[PDB]
């Protein structure tokens, strides 16, 4: 209980950094990421492989809403966590995939609730170590 | 003290020469199976198709016991390369995971070839200062 917390499946209606979502603590220096990583979020699917983010990868996330246009963010669209490249246009924000197989998500803040969970600051790829 | 960073390796100099260490990273080595011994900065996009982008720090377990299909660190005539090992017979090949790169054939009669170790994952962290 002393290192970076590891988040996997996120229930809907429950915060991401909820203790019931936390399934480990990895002893990895935070400041090795810039901004520093606050937690590791296991990535789902292949939407960001073109930048080397694969299913199973632990995305080192800085918890913040301080995210510029162009950066890769962790976002929550109607309770759903997604890791995409950001391009925010007033309250029509476009989340972009890094995989020409997927289409870019437009999310109307008039239609869905949208939260920026934090900035993507790296990945760790370790798999099963026991 | 933690895991050593290893950038480019000068020809004739060994890999883990203190001259080549560009840092120590505080990362639990037993978070990799088998455990990480050093992080090697990957150079180029030959392995992009499994997520190993150019610039990544590949976690590496120091060993020569490498099975085929495994992704390894190899030195072909003083040239460190990360590729997938195809041992199948008296035959051993270095396979990329990038359609624009051809397989590399290792003939131990033409080239000096050492298995530097096993890749047990990557750390993509970039510049932190």
């Amino acid at each position, epitope marked *: 209980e002393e290192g970076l917390p590891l988040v996997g499946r996120v229930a809907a209606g429950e915060p991401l950094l909820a203790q019931q979502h936390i399934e480990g603590h990895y002893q990895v220096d935070p400041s090795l990421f810039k901004p520093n990583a606050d937690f590791l979020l296991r990535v789902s699917g292949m939407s960001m492989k073109d930048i080397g983010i694969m299913d199973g990868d632990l995305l080192a996330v800085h918890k913040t809403q301080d995210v510029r246009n162009g950066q890769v963010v962790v976002a929550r669209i109607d309770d759903e966590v997604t890791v995409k490249r950001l391009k925010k246009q007033g309250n029509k924000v476009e989340l972009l995939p890094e995989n020409s197989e997927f289409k870019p998500i437009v999310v109307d803040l008039r239609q869905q609730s949208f939260t920026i969970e934090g900035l993507a600051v790296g990945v760790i790829r370790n798999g099963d170590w*026991l | 003290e933690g895991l050593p960073l290893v950038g480019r390796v000068a020809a004739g100099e060994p890999l883990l020469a203190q001259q080549h260490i560009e840092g120590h990273y505080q990362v639990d080595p037993s978070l990799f199976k088998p455990n990480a011994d050093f992080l090697l900065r990957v150079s180029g996009m030959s392995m992009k198709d499994i997520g190993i982008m150019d610039g990544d720090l590949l976690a590496v377990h120091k060993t020569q016991d490498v099975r085929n299909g495994q992704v390894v660190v190899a030195r072909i005539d003083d040239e460190v390369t990360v590729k997938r090992l195809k041992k199948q017979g008296n035959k051993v090949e270095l396979l990329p995971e990038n359609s624009e790169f051809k397989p590399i054939v290792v003939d131990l009669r033409q080239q000096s070839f050492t298995i530097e170790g096993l890749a047990v994952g990557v750390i993509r962290n970039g510049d932190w200062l």
Partner: nanobody
Amino acid sequence: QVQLVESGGGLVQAGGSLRLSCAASGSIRSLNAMGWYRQAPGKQRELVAAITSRGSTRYGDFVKGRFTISRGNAKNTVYLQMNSLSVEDTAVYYCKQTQLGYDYWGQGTQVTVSS
């Protein structure tokens, strides 16, 4: 070569708790990991908890905060504090160690949580 000695299983009434422990004899590298998988009759073997010699920890995705793995003041000994157990947690709980990429199993310790 490593020798793994389980203790602490048995029957528990749902909502109750029970602690498992493992001790690893033999040639133990400084760097290693230990913990528990588990196996319900019929299903496959699942990761429960794991812990490195250096303190890092991982839990299976059913644990949901409920369990806690820790290494003891003892050397090469971990305990798994299982709390809030559910009948669906009834399984055979094998202890596990790797070092250098080779695995080592325990004999198994059965845990029956009853309705």
